[PDB]
């Protein structure tokens, strides 16, 4: 009579769990290397009626996996590549004076050196244009800025660094829960839950200050600061609309090739065709104003609505966070975005051209054990992108709930991964289970 | 908007007295000890955990914004200024005496 507990199988159970993500893609590019398995055009989402699930942003380790997965790729792409250590020979230089726009003066140097031919016994004079950013004076003549740091390398310019979406799929017996709620706070339960066995691609693209090409917020601009009272935390900001940005590298770039050993081509910058001009970026002025108004409305959700909100010029620190940077067009750029923050907000022609800079020696991420040369790319660079959000920080020590101010900040790439990954969590399916029954086992 | 208060003023308590001090604050609370001519040191943090190597005499409790700190069996070596802190904000020091 008394109930017997008995076996059932395949009953849904969720456990929070972590497994290694499986890479997949639509259909050489560094980001996919074409090694990711191609995947089916069948995003068969399953709405989960009557369920809710906790999701905690900044707790998911998919973010961490992505963060190190891309690093491993980056190194993998460079391990085949030729070392540039012959370039630590000191250089004679002059400031370039040929057709220089006045605000470009001293930006480039023409320099030369006694570096070797591919023959073991011979040397040749060599010269190239260089950005002033990539060199330091040998004494109060120049040397590459990284010769006192781990060695510079570069080869294999053919590989593309343009972003390609990357998809991640749960291992069999696991699934990816997601939250569709347009109002979702970075943490806690979500009523909108549905699931997929895999996810839509996410681009590897990075920025040091503003999110680029991210998914738009579903309803309204949103902010995810974690516990906002702690101002050491980065403030995520997600636009619910795109902001177009156009940029250029107006100089007509040309290329030179050098042999530094057998089989070892070395890229060098040819003289620019035409007048030298600064790299720049155009954004709508009006749109920038409008979207800031959307942002401050969001900020006020945590404050009295008559509070003062301010934006500011960057507080400095390392250039990689002091300025906005991107690899669009296959070449690195930096810009002075501080003009974008020259405003304050109170209760109650059509565009801007930001100045920019180019550095060819890239020290990736926070690492100091590696550096690489970026090859010249011939012609004018053009770039078009959608700005989809901001990485912001807030000054500590404010009082009387007013005059809060903000600056661009962060630059840990992990937060970029989070801007997309907050939508998902990985769970483990535990099909096994038991329940009481009126049944007792049959006689043998 | 974080705010905090404290009631200790300064205390005249005799040696070997168990003594207490209290504060209240918005957010997480950490308590510190300091002596003239010296850097502050952590005693208890997040309203409940002693820092490693803190003497057994130290203790405390939390009730929401309420925070209590005590020293069992106070020793002459324990006469010091004390603090309550939340992030960048800290209460002005208070101190033991006799």
């Amino acid at each position, epitope marked *: 009579e008394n109930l017997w507990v008995t076996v059932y199988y395949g009953v849904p159970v969720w456990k929070d769990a972590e497994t290694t993500l499986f890479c997949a893609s639509d259909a050489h590019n560094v980001w996919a290397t074409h090694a990711c398995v191609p995947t089916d055009p069948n995003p068969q989402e399953i709405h989960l009626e009557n369920v809710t699930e906790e999701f905690n942003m900044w707790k998911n380790n998919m973010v961490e996996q992505m963060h190190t997965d891309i690093i491993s790729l980056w190194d993998q792409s460079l391990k085949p590549c030729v070392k540039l250590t012959p370039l630590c020979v000191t250089l004679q230089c002059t400031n370039v004076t040929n057709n220089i726009t006045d605000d470009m003066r001293g930006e480039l140097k023409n320099c030369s050196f006694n570096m070797t031919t591919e023959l073991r016994d011979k040397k040749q004079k060599v010269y190239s244009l260089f950005y002033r950013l990539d060199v330091v004076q040998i004494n109060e003549e120049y040397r590459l800025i990284n010769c006192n740091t781990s060695a510079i390398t570069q080869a294999c310019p053919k590989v593309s660094f343009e972003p390609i979406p990357i998809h991640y799929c749960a291992p069999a017996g696991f699934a990816i829960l997601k939250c569709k709620d347009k109002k979702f706070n970075g943490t806690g339960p979500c009523p909108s839950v549905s699931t997929v066995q895999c996810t839509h691609g996410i681009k590897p693209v990075v920025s040091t200050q503003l999110l680029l090409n991210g998914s738009l917020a579903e309803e309204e601009v949103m902010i995810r600061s974690e516990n906002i009272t702690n101002n050491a935390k980065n403030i995520l900001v997600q636009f619910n609309t795109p902001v177009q940005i156009n940029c250029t590298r107006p100089n007509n770039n040309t290329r030179k090739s050098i042999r530094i050993g057998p089989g070892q081509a070395f890229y060098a910058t040819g003289d620019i065709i035409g007048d030298i001009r600064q790299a720049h970026c155009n954004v709508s002025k009006a749109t920038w104003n409008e979207t800031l108004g959307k942002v401050v409305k969001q900020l006020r959700k945590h404050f009295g609505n008559n509070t003062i909100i301010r934006f500011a010029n960057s507080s400095g620190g390392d250039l990689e966070v002091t300025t906005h940077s991107f690899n669009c067009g296959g070449e690195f750029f930096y810009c002075n975005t501080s003009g974008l923050f020259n405003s304050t907000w109170i209760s109650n022609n059509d565009s801007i051209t930001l100045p920019c800079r180019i550095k060819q020696i890239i020290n990736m991420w*926070q690492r100091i054990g590696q550096a690489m040369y970026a090859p010249p790319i011939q012609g004018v660079i053009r770039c078009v992108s959608n700005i989809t959000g901001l990485i912001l920080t807030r000054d*500590g020590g404010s009082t009387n709930s007013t005059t809060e101010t903000f600056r661009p900040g962060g630059g840990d790439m992990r937060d970029n991964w989070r801007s997309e990954l907050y939508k998902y969590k990985v769970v483990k399916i535990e099909p096994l289970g038991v329940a009481p029954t009126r049944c007792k086992r049959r006689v043998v | 908007d974080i705010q905090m208060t404290q009631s200790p003023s300064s205390l005249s308590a005799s040696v070997g007295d168990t003594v207490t001090i209290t504060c209240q604050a918005n957010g*997480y609370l950490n308590w510190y000890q300091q002596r003239r001519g010296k850097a502050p040191k952590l005693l208890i943090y997040d309203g409940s955990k002693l820092e490693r190597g803190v003497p057994s005499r130290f203790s405390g409790r939390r009730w929401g914004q309420e925070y209590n700190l005590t020293i069992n069996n106070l020793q002459p070596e324990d006469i010091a200024t004390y603090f309550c*802190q*939340v992030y960048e904000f*800290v209460v002005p020091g208070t101190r033991l005496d006799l």
Partner: nanobody
Framework: QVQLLQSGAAVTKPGASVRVSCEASGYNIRDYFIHWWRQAPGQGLQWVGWINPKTGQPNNPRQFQGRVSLTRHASWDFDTYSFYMDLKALRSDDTAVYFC????????????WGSGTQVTV
């Protein structure tokens, strides 16, 4: 030994620009925020700012804007790190004991303090 090196005391005439410093010792600096604190003698501590040592990124109160700067440095073999604080000008109310601290956790736990130094005007 995790303890920070602390630079010596100094005094200058008003309007002077000054520098103070500290150095990382027993731990990987990359994982912790560094903070600066100051106090008038006879007074409770005042937060000065923080710097993210990985990026060199300062954070200061509106009170100190444009008057103070924070920097960070590292050994070329990266086994040491240094921090500096600069003041553009001094006034008698800038006299304080100044010190470095380590943020142990997100509760702004300070389990490491420099001995501090005395800056006077």
């Amino acid at each position: 030994q995790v303890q920070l090196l602390q630079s010596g005391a100094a005094v200058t005439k008003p309007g002077a620009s000054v520098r103070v410093s500290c150095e990382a010792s027993g731990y990987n600096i990359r994982d912790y925020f560094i903070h600066w604190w100051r106090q008038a003698p006879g007074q409770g501590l005042q937060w000065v700012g923080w710097i993210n040592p990985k990026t060199g990124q300062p954070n200061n109160p509106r009170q100190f804007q444009g008057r103070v700067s924070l920097t960070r440095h590292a050994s070329w073999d990266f086994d040491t790190y240094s921090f500096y604080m600069d003041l553009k000008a001094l006034r008698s109310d800038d006299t304080a004991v100044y010190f470095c601290a380590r943020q142990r956790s997100d509760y702004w736990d300070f389990d490491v303090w420099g001995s501090g130094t005395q800056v006077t005007v």
